[PDB]
Amino acid sequence: MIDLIVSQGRVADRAAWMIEGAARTARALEERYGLKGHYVGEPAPHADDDWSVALPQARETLVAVREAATESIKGDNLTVLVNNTCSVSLATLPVVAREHPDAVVLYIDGHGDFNTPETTDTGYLGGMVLSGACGLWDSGHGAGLRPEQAVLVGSRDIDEGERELIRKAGVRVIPPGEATAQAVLDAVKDAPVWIHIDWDVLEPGSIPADYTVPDGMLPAQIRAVFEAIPAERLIGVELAELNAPADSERAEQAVAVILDMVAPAFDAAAA
Ligand SMILES: [Mg+2]
Ligand SMILES: [Mn+2]
Ligand SMILES: [Mn+2]
């Protein structure tokens, strides 16, 4: 009752180990849930190319992810995408919005990912994902997601220009200190839900965080969101941007934390 799809093709990656982090996350989910992932795309090295170059390079991977996600969304299972970068979602979010026009997208990210070609300072496609799916610029992979149906969760320290694009489009923002499970439920109302996570939303892991207030979201806050969304309402989940080398102890520890956060939703879908 879980469909696992894994992107292994470059989609604008500027970090070295996000394809490897996706592979390791997928492996952990396969072992825990008795699944076999559908792996899509061919790895290629990271580079600091402009979105206008990285985007056409990624077309074959994006099209193949789109076709796999479409089948899964049209079937009866929970669609789980383990993605190297948020930019994979330029292919998936238009499908979600077309198949489920009432869905709310929870875009859980330390960033807004709401830049356009006019506003980006770095040229990075991964900073342009939600705005592209919402049609503020044309990714070549469709749009159709209403900004009114998108909620940024955990985002903070957003550039002033980008924050005003978000405001003018109607995208709600729930910063980490407001991102309780109930605050997220209040934003979703009766809608079916698609969850997209960029792991940079998380507070940088620190042993002694009992006496300071975190700037990012805590793993417990992410877990509480997964516990709160009714299984009958969850369309799918994207897990993106784990930058951890294959075979590293660090990846081993990171995927254990990931499995703990997603367990309430994935356990329910598996049962
Ligand atoms: Mg489903
Ligand atoms: Mn992101
Ligand atoms: Mn981010």
Cα-atom Rg, whole angstroms?
17 Å
Shape: globular
Bound molecules: magnesium ion, manganese (II) ion
Number of helical runs? 9
Which class best fits the helix and strand makeup? alpha/beta
Task: Tell me the major beta sheet.
Answer: 8 strands, parallel
Q: How many extended strands? A: 8
Q: Can you tell me the number of structural domains? A: 1
End-to-end separation in angstroms reads 8 Å
Helix content: 25-40%
Counting copies of identical and different chains, the oligomeric state is monomer
Strand % is 5-15%
Order of helices and strands: EHEHHEHEHEHEHEHEH
Biggest sheet strand order reads: 2-1-3-8-7-4-5-6
Strand and helix map with partners:
Blueprint: E1 2-7, H1 18-33, E2 38-40, H2 51-57, H3 59-74, E3 78-83, H4 89-99, E4 104-108, H5 129-133, E5 150-153, H6 160-169, E6 172-174, H7 181-188, E7 193-198, H8 219-228, E8 234-240, H9 249-270
Parallel strand pairs: 1-2, 1-3, 3-8, 4-5, 4-7, 5-6, 7-8
Helix pairs in contact: 1-9, 3-4, 7-8, 8-9
The protein binds magnesium ion and manganese (II) ion (2 copies).
One manganese (II) ion (MN) is lined by residues 109-111, 198, 200.
Task: Tell me briefly what this model is.
It is classed as antibiotic. By secondary structure, the chain is of the alpha/beta class.
